[PDB]
C-alpha cells in the first residue's frame, strides 16, 4: 500500500519511560538473591531488550526465544539457559491479543522458575482475547497502526528509534 | 574470583557506532536493492539495536544463531537474502573461524552483496583471513565483557565494554 509514517512516541519519551521501567524492575527484584533472566521474544523485542537491560541494576542473564506467529504456539528457538529456581522477566515489544505471551508463559511455568513476570513496551488492552498478567507496561495505546522500535510493517521500519503511526494512502 | 574494569566507556561506544552508521549509510544508500542486517546471537543483540538505529537506509533486521567442531545453524534467518545487500553484525572477531564459515553459508544464497561489521576486533587472535569491511575498535587480547558479551552468563547488560581481572 502507498502510505506514510509520522512520529507517535519520540525516541526521547521512549528513553525516559524505559529508565522508569528499569527503576521499577530494579526495585521489585533487587532483594530477591536468586539468579535473574530477561527473556526476549524475537524478533520484536531485540531493541526494547537492549535499552531495558541497560536500565536494570540487578545482576542478570539475557536470553531469547522465537515462538511461531487458533494454530498452536510452537517453539522455533528455545532458551539457551535453564530458568529453574530463577526470577524470569519476559520482555516483548507489544501485547495486543495476548495469545502468544499467554502460551509462552505457560511453557516457561512448567520449568518451575522462582517467579515469572512480563514487561511490554506497548499495550493495546482493547485487543485482548486471552487474559494474561502484565506487571510492567511502557505505554497504553488505542489500536493504532504502529511501527518502529522492533515493530515491522512489510519487513520495513524495525530499525526506527521512535514509535510511528502508519497512514494508509 | 575477579573484578571488571571499564575498558571502553559507554560514550566512546556511542560516538563510534554513530561513525560506523554514517560509513554504512554512505556505502549502501545508492544500491536501491533490499538490505538486511543479520546479527549473530546471542552476543550481537545490543550492538545490533544501537547500530541499526544509526543506519539511514531502509533495511530488515534478522538474526541467526551459529555454534575442532563444525559450524552448525542452531537458528537460521526468517527472511530470504537472495538478491539483497547483507551486512553480518557481530560483537567480536578473534580467530575469524565462525564468521568465515557463516559468510560461506550465506554466500550460497546468492545475496547481491555480503559484508561484516564487528564492534570489536582482536587481530592478535586471527587464525583464518576473513575480510571485515567495518570495525568499531581493534583491541588487545583482553578478557572482554559487557555490551552483549558474557563471562559465565554474567555482564551482558553492561552499557560499556569491561575487562575481567582474575
Swiss-Prot record, chain A:
Pathway the protein acts in: Purine metabolism; IMP biosynthesis via salvage pathway; IMP from hypoxanthine: step 1/1
Query: Where along the chain is diphosphate bound?
Result: 43-44, 158
Give the catalysed reaction(s), semicolon-separated.
IMP + diphosphate = hypoxanthine + 5-phospho-alpha-D-ribose 1-diphosphate; GMP + diphosphate = guanine + 5-phospho-alpha-D-ribose 1-diphosphate
Enzyme Commission no: 2.4.2.8
InterPro entries with a match to the protein in the record: HGPRT (IPR050408), Hxn_phspho_trans (IPR005904), PRibTrfase_dom (IPR000836), PRTase-like (IPR029057)
Indicate the enzyme's highest-level EC class.
Answer: transferase
- Record: residues binding Mg(2+): 92-93
Q: Which GO terms describe its cellular component?
A: cytosol
* Superkingdom to which the source organism belongs: Bacteria
- Residues recorded as binding GMP, renumbered to this chain, are 92, 96-101, 124, 152
UniProt main location, coarse:
cytoplasm
Its annotated compartments are: Cytoplasm
Q: Does the keyword Cell membrane apply?
A: no
- GO biological processes: GMP salvage; guanine salvage; hypoxanthine metabolic process; IMP salvage; purine ribonucleoside salvage
Binding of IMP occurs at: 92, 96-101, 124
- For whether the record's keyword set contains Hydrolase, the answer is no
Can you tell me which residues form the catalytic site?
96 (proton acceptor)
**CDD domains, from UniProt?**
PRTases_typeI
Q: Name one GO molecular function term.
A: hypoxanthine phosphoribosyltransferase activity
Cite the entry's keywords alphabetically.
Cytoplasm, Glycosyltransferase, Magnesium, Metal-binding, Nucleotide-binding, Purine salvage, Transferase
Q: So what does this one do?
A: Purine salvage pathway enzyme which catalyzes the transfer of the ribosyl-5-phosphate group from 5-phospho-alpha-D-ribose 1-diphosphate (PRPP) to the N9 position of hypoxanthine to yield IMP (inosine 5'-monophosphate). To a lesser extent, can also act on guanine leading to GMP, but shows a highly less efficient activity with xanthine.
Protein family: Belongs to the purine/pyrimidine phosphoribosyltransferase family.
Its assembly, as annotated, is:
Homotetramer.
What protein name applies here?
Answer: Hypoxanthine phosphoribosyltransferase
Task: Name the species this protein comes from.
Answer: Escherichia coli O6:H1 (strain CFT073 / ATCC 700928 / UPEC)
**Gene that encodes it:** hpt
Amino acid at each position: 500500500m502507498k502510505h506514510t509514517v509520522e512520529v507517535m512516541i519520540p525516541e526521547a519519551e521512549i528513553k525516559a519511560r524505559i529508565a522508569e521501567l528499569g527503576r521499577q524492575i530494579t526495585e521489585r527484584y533487587k532483594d530477591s538473591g536468586s539468579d535473574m533472566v530477561l527473556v526476549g521474544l524475537l524478533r520484536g523485542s531485540f531493541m526494547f531488550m537492549a535499552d531495558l537491560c541497560r536500565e536494570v541494576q540487578v545482576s542478570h542473564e539475557v536470553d531469547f526465544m522465537t515462538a511461531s506467529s487458533t494454530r498452536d504456539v510452537k517453539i522455533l528457538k528455545d532458551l539457551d539457559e535453564d530458568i529453574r529456581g530463577k526470577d524470569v522477566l519476559i520482555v516483548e515489544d507489544i501485547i495486543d491479543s495476548g495469545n502468544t505471551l499467554s502460551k509462552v508463559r505457560e511453557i516457561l511455568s512448567l520449568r518451575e522458575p522462582k517467579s515469572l513476570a512480563i514487561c511490554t513496551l506497548l499495550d493495546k488492552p482493547s485487543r485482548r482475547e486471552v487474559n494474561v498478567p502484565v506487571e510492567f507496561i511502557g505505554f497504553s495505546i488505542p489500536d493504532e497502526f504502529v511501527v518502529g522500535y522492533g515493530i515491522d510493517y512489510a519487513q520495513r521500519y524495525r530499525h526506527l528509534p521512535y514509535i510511528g503511526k502508519v497512514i494508509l494512502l
